[PDB]
Amino acid sequence: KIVNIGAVLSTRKHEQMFREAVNQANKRHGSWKIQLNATSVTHKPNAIQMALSVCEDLISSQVYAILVSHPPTPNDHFTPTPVSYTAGFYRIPVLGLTTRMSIYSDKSIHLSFLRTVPPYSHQSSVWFEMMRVYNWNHIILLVSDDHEGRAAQKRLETLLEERESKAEKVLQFDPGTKNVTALLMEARELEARVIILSASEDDAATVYRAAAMLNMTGSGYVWLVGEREISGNALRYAPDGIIGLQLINGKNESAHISDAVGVVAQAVHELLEKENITDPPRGCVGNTNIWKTGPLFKRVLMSSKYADGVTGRVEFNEDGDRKFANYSIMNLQNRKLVQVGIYNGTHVIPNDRKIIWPGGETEKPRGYQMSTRLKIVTIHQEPFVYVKPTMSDGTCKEEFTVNGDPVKKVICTGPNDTSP
């Protein structure tokens, strides 16, 4: 008649808020004889013995939900992976709350991982909403993180399946290098100016410095970044007038904990109304038998529909992501973050503030400038393409035909013979 909830939480004030939310979860659910216990664990700077302590403590506690709620970690790995893997050995849902990596989106790897935050590729759909507003077709993709790069390419092809257009340039490379300005100039020679960037803070600051030194931040250059690219030294290296995104209550932990408590509590009270109740065994010593209602409780969590919370309509898709997310659209006006738009789950509305661009007017810059110098290639056709060597140095002998027509030649460039 008890339900245990495991948590990896640091601060004592948010532990008290979590215990208060557990205590208030049994308020409106009547005088039913179910009980709710909570067990929270603290930090150690390592990761192997942390995984050991948490996994055997949650085996000895026999919990149903495992929560990790640590945004400001000094290690940039952001890996609650081993506790989720240990719970996936018995198919126990771990509700991740902080990270947004696309490696957690693979349910074949993370068998029993759920989360209430989407990955950044859904922001590209918001950027596809830009394509629904500003009517721009040709884009320039730049992704350094190859763990999420294939998922970003997949989401981009899924978005472009509707219009049946094609991305003009895609780029994937190893993060850490600095001489990527050649591909930046190759994208500069293209007609489009739409710049989509998906990397960490260091590569974003590197390409900001590369665009600042080569002046790729002038008129018409479309810049469109996210929350990871407007933090750290990338915010210092950002040009004025850049358009970015903001997660509403993305780092606000206190209401997020209460939302997670409400989700887990209504999931448990939904599961108590059905049959075939199983319990996690003492899997540390002599128990390798899996928890048989793993996918059953996962199917319970699939159809979880909610109506409570400050954020709003939290809802899981087939990937277990977040539906109907309020986003903000920010602008950098003279090294100051200025809000220029709001976003409900389907539509963008700009606010009363104006949209000041890094180029000219406040309207949208049509960054689709066709090539005024069309690169012409041809084969040496014998009666059609006459190729003559130069006389002295790069010159053409202006000979005249028998019908009074002067031959208007052109300075072309060509190889001499075959490759052997």
């Binding site: 340039k169 293209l190 690169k375 012409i376 290639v377």
Partner: protein, 50 residues
Amino acid sequence: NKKEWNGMMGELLSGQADMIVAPLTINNERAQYIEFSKPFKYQGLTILVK
């Protein structure tokens, strides 16, 4: 086991070229991959003998 093109099509699809100005033999295979313009030349085939 990947299909690739070469020649003028290989230099055009790589982005290094913009417009092939050449007597392009219009067929059904290349029409599936790129768009075609109106033909300026109209002729057939023949056999060169001595």
